[PDB]
Design an enzyme around this catalytic site. Structure first.
Site, PDB file in Angstrom:
ATOM      1  N   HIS A 106      69.702  53.660  97.536  1.00 21.77           N
ATOM      2  CA  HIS A 106      69.327  52.625  96.574  1.00 21.77           C
ATOM      3  C   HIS A 106      70.561  51.896  96.066  1.00 21.77           C
ATOM      4  O   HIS A 106      70.468  50.787  95.542  1.00 21.77           O
ATOM      5  CB  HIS A 106      68.594  53.252  95.391  1.00 21.77           C
ATOM      6  CG  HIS A 106      67.405  54.064  95.788  1.00 21.77           C
ATOM      7  ND1 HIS A 106      67.237  55.374  95.396  1.00 21.77           N
ATOM      8  CD2 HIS A 106      66.324  53.751  96.540  1.00 21.77           C
ATOM      9  CE1 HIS A 106      66.101  55.834  95.888  1.00 21.77           C
ATOM     10  NE2 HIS A 106      65.528  54.870  96.586  1.00 21.77           N
ATOM     11  N   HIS A 116      77.017  52.626  89.207  1.00 21.89           N
ATOM     12  CA  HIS A 116      76.530  52.189  90.506  1.00 21.89           C
ATOM     13  C   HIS A 116      76.481  50.673  90.525  1.00 21.89           C
ATOM     14  O   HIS A 116      76.768  50.023  89.516  1.00 21.89           O
ATOM     15  CB  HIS A 116      75.138  52.771  90.798  1.00 21.89           C
ATOM     16  CG  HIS A 116      74.116  52.437  89.759  1.00 21.89           C
ATOM     17  ND1 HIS A 116      73.951  53.184  88.612  1.00 21.89           N
ATOM     18  CD2 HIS A 116      73.237  51.410  89.671  1.00 21.89           C
ATOM     19  CE1 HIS A 116      73.014  52.631  87.861  1.00 21.89           C
ATOM     20  NE2 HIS A 116      72.565  51.554  88.480  1.00 21.89           N
ATOM     21  N   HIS A 130      74.532  46.831  92.122  1.00 23.02           N
ATOM     22  CA  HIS A 130      73.362  46.106  92.615  1.00 23.02           C
ATOM     23  C   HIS A 130      73.952  44.838  93.221  1.00 23.02           C
ATOM     24  O   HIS A 130      74.775  44.175  92.589  1.00 23.02           O
ATOM     25  CB  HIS A 130      72.413  45.765  91.466  1.00 23.02           C
ATOM     26  CG  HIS A 130      71.824  46.969  90.802  1.00 23.02           C
ATOM     27  ND1 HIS A 130      70.698  47.606  91.276  1.00 23.02           N
ATOM     28  CD2 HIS A 130      72.233  47.679  89.724  1.00 23.02           C
ATOM     29  CE1 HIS A 130      70.437  48.658  90.519  1.00 23.02           C
ATOM     30  NE2 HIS A 130      71.354  48.725  89.571  1.00 23.02           N
ATOM     31  N   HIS A 143      76.761  48.864  86.854  1.00 25.06           N
ATOM     32  CA  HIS A 143      76.107  49.564  85.749  1.00 25.06           C
ATOM     33  C   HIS A 143      76.793  50.893  85.489  1.00 25.06           C
ATOM     34  O   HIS A 143      76.995  51.675  86.413  1.00 25.06           O
ATOM     35  CB  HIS A 143      74.636  49.855  86.070  1.00 25.06           C
ATOM     36  CG  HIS A 143      73.754  48.647  86.055  1.00 25.06           C
ATOM     37  ND1 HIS A 143      72.494  48.644  86.617  1.00 25.06           N
ATOM     38  CD2 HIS A 143      73.943  47.407  85.548  1.00 25.06           C
ATOM     39  CE1 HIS A 143      71.949  47.452  86.460  1.00 25.06           C
ATOM     40  NE2 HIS A 143      72.808  46.682  85.815  1.00 25.06           N
ATOM     41  N   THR A 177      66.030  50.119  85.475  1.00 23.30           N
ATOM     42  CA  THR A 177      65.569  49.096  86.403  1.00 23.30           C
ATOM     43  C   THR A 177      65.005  49.659  87.706  1.00 23.30           C
ATOM     44  O   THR A 177      64.652  48.905  88.612  1.00 23.30           O
ATOM     45  CB  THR A 177      66.700  48.108  86.736  1.00 23.30           C
ATOM     46  OG1 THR A 177      67.740  48.789  87.444  1.00 23.30           O
ATOM     47  CG2 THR A 177      67.272  47.514  85.456  1.00 23.30           C
ATOM     48  N   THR A 178      64.929  50.984  87.795  1.00 23.45           N
ATOM     49  CA  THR A 178      64.384  51.655  88.971  1.00 23.45           C
ATOM     50  C   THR A 178      63.533  52.806  88.446  1.00 23.45           C
ATOM     51  O   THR A 178      63.756  53.279  87.330  1.00 23.45           O
ATOM     52  CB  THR A 178      65.501  52.236  89.877  1.00 23.45           C
ATOM     53  OG1 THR A 178      66.186  53.283  89.181  1.00 23.45           O
ATOM     54  CG2 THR A 178      66.504  51.149  90.265  1.00 23.45           C
TER      55      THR A 178
HETATM   56  C1  AZM Z   1      69.062  59.091  85.468  1.00 27.82           C
HETATM   57  C2  AZM Z   1      69.614  57.747  85.818  1.00 27.82           C
HETATM   58  O1  AZM Z   1      70.747  57.392  85.555  1.00 27.82           O
HETATM   59  N1  AZM Z   1      68.719  56.902  86.477  1.00 27.82           N
HETATM   60  C3  AZM Z   1      68.802  55.524  86.551  1.00 27.82           C
HETATM   61  N2  AZM Z   1      67.874  54.827  87.174  1.00 27.82           N
HETATM   62  N3  AZM Z   1      68.099  53.470  87.086  1.00 27.82           N
HETATM   63  C4  AZM Z   1      69.173  53.213  86.419  1.00 27.82           C
HETATM   64  S1  AZM Z   1      69.719  51.546  86.113  1.00 27.82           S
HETATM   65  N4  AZM Z   1      69.680  50.744  87.471  1.00 27.82           N
HETATM   66  O2  AZM Z   1      68.732  51.008  85.242  1.00 27.82           O
HETATM   67  O3  AZM Z   1      71.072  51.665  85.675  1.00 27.82           O
HETATM   68  S2  AZM Z   1      70.049  54.574  85.820  1.00 27.82           S
HETATM   69 ZN    ZN Z   2      71.514  49.960  87.949  1.00 28.27          ZN
END
Ligand code: AZM
Ligand code: ZN
Ligand SMILES: *[C@@H]1O[C@H](CO)[C@@H](O[C@@H]2O[C@H](CO)[C@@H](O[C@@H]3O[C@H](CO[C@H]4O[C@H](CO)[C@@H](O)[C@H](O)[C@@H]4O)[C@@H](O)[C@H](O[C@H]4O[C@H](CO)[C@@H](O)[C@H](O)[C@@H]4O)[C@@H]3O)[C@H](O)[C@H]2NC(C)=O)[C@H](O)[C@H]1NC(C)=O
Ligand SMILES: *[C@@H]1O[C@H](CO)[C@@H](O[C@@H]2O[C@H](CO)[C@@H](O[C@@H]3O[C@H](CO[C@H]4O[C@H](CO)[C@@H](O)[C@H](O)[C@@H]4O)[C@@H](O)[C@H](O[C@H]4O[C@H](CO)[C@@H](O)[C@H](O)[C@@H]4O)[C@@H]3O)[C@H](O)[C@H]2NC(C)=O)[C@H](O)[C@H]1NC(C)=O
Ligand code: AZM
Ligand code: ZN
Lengths: 252, 257
Positions: free
Chosen positions: B66, B92, B94, B117, B198-199
């Site tokens: 992802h 991470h 995007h 993020h 967002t996931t």
């Molecule tokens: C436990 C954890 O960190 N999960 C997340 N899932 N989506 C995220 S986000 N893209 O909103 O930063 S962080």
């Molecule tokens: Zn994110």
């Protein structure tokens, strides 16, 4: 057991009572930050019917009314809570007793309606968690007219004069105990004003007050018996320093 | 249902089936309209301490299909305000694809090349699973990555390692790096609002802080980011962002006039 004006030291009862960000605080309107994002408070389900009755109790530190499920409140879009109980803080003959102060001014009394975030099933899970608990506070001022809403509570105090006693009272419109404008208020993050003094509590203080007669205020601060065969009075905490926190205002 | 943990961008299973919260009324990301942001003078400069990590120990960098995720160690303390502390857990990215931006948040409808993020956990919660869905339990710092003429040294540490983890599920240990160097220069200018992950599980109650200033990467670096990793099935890991979600009444705050 903790008490007002004496041992045991609150920090011994709960470490959090010595935290850097405690409540209550002194509110200085000119230094409050106007925050346009603060929308009008929403309170639904507060108009309770005559039955079932509600428990009213003298717990030694205040008179507390137990609220039923269904009193939904929102501090903003998607930020919902449900009311758990309400209680009061007062002074004594010739002495104001509100917890919060405005520009150094202490009001005769103050009412607190405690809410639990819908994200937490129980209070013990919310304690110390950011926004877990939210309290609505309103100042009670002296006025020429007697307050009908408060008459429902004040007229029952004598029934629970002795510490630890309780009684059932008829359902009442809880929202009638609050100020007229739900769009004018101050907001900041602090703590419970009594042990465990857990932090992370969102405080919302109405800018408008409610009025009670001189007689009603006397009834509120001179009826209940507190710990040690003495009138339960001056049951409020001294104001705590903001220590950098900035109070927000929902109005310019 | 079976395999509840599985999800992907651009196809089944429907996110609401993975997690009901993905259909909540207050989701992220959102489109930010500066003109409609509420100036909130109570928003003080962000504080980030312990982000300058030494060469050792190493950190895990993983292609989870992802995104590419860097696991952060204990010690990275962040504050959104006095007495409102968090600790970083991971970061991470995007991104988009050839000639296509891929940030999650947008500003005035504009989508940026990519977005970073940095996910944080409130110090009031011992574990993430306890923070999920709770107000302010999780806080994410977000910054936009734009195209620029110079190669970004900080991001080179991550981008140069993507080839080692091209396949989904692959991971590698990388040298310690200054995490704060991946962020914009001004920590006092940002937008803030409450939303969700967002996931999936898309848990709500997440405090989003989006830097007003951006960071720059060279065109070559942006191409390396979007054209090196492989995602679920046989597809390239690209366009890994969620569509804009409506504010639905929420008011975005700005830390600057
Ligand atoms: C436990 C954890 O960190 N999960 C997340 N899932 N989506 C995220 S986000 N893209 O909103 O930063 S962080
Ligand atoms: Zn994110
Ligand atoms: C609900 O919210 C309202 C709105 O914010 C609050 O009302 C304001 O309250 C503040 C604080 O009490 C008031 O501020 C005071 O204003 C006075 C101005 O009055 C005259 O004097 C100046 C000249 O000095 C003229 O320019 C002006 O036109 C007036 O003619 C000041 O005199 C006060 O300051 C003095 O006292 C304080 C200590 O008390 C000292 O620190 C100062 O140095 C100075 O000596 C003070 O600044 C303000 O006027 C109110 N605004 C309105 C619109 O009413 C409510 O208090 C709040 N209520 C609740 C329950 O929350
Ligand atoms: C960091 O934060 C800054 C500060 O807020 C952001 O910069 C602002 O961004 C907004 C939105 O992009 C800009 O707003 C736009 O201003 C234009 C004004 O420019 C000229 O036109 C008007 C005529 O009406 C003249 O009066 C004026 O003097 C200028 O000559 C408007 O034209 C825009 O509105 C129109 O276009 C948009 C589409 O883009 C439509 O949606 C509107 O309906 C309308 O038709 C718009 O209002 C603002 O100018 C910027 N301010 C500054 C100081 O630069 C950054 O974007 C932000 N960055 C990040 C990464 O967060
Ligand atoms: C769980 C609970 O309601 N306890 C409280 N203790 N002090 C409170 S106060 N005075 O800050 O409203 S609420
Ligand atoms: Zn109280």
């Amino acid at each position: 057991h903790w008490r007002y004006g004496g041992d045991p030291p609150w920090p011994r009862v709960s470490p959090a009572c010595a935290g850097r960000f405690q409540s209550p605080v002194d509110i200085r309107p000119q230094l409050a930050a106007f925050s346009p994002a603060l929308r009008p408070l929403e309170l639904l389900g507060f108009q309770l019917p005559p039955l079932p009755e509600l428990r009213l109790r003298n717990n030694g530190h205040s008179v507390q009314l137990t609220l039923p499920p269904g009193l939904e409140m929102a501090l903003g879009p998607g930020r919902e809570y449900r009311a758990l109980q309400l209680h009061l803080h007062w002074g004594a003959a010739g002495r104001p007793g509100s917890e919060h102060t405005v520009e150094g001014h202490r009001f005769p009394a103050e009412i607190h309606v405690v809410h639990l975030s819908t994200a937490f099933a129980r209070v013990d899970e919310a304690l110390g968690r950011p926004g877990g608990l939210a309290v609505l506070a309103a100042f009670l001022e002296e006025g020429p007219e007697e307050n009908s809403a408060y008459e429902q509570l004040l007229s029952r105090l004598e029934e629970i004069a002795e510490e630890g006693s309780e009684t059932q009272v008829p359902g009442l419109d809880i929202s009638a105990l609050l100020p007229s404008d739900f769009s004018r208020y101050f907001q900041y993050e602090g703590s419970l004003t009594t042990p465990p003094c857990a932090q992370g509590v969102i405080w919302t203080v109405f800018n408008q007050t409610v009025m009670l007669s001189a007689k009603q205020l006397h009834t509120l601060s001179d009826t209940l018996w507190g710990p040690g065969d003495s009138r339960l009075q001056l049951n409020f905490r001294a104001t705590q320093p903001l220590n950098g926190r900035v109070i927000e205002a929902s109005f310019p």
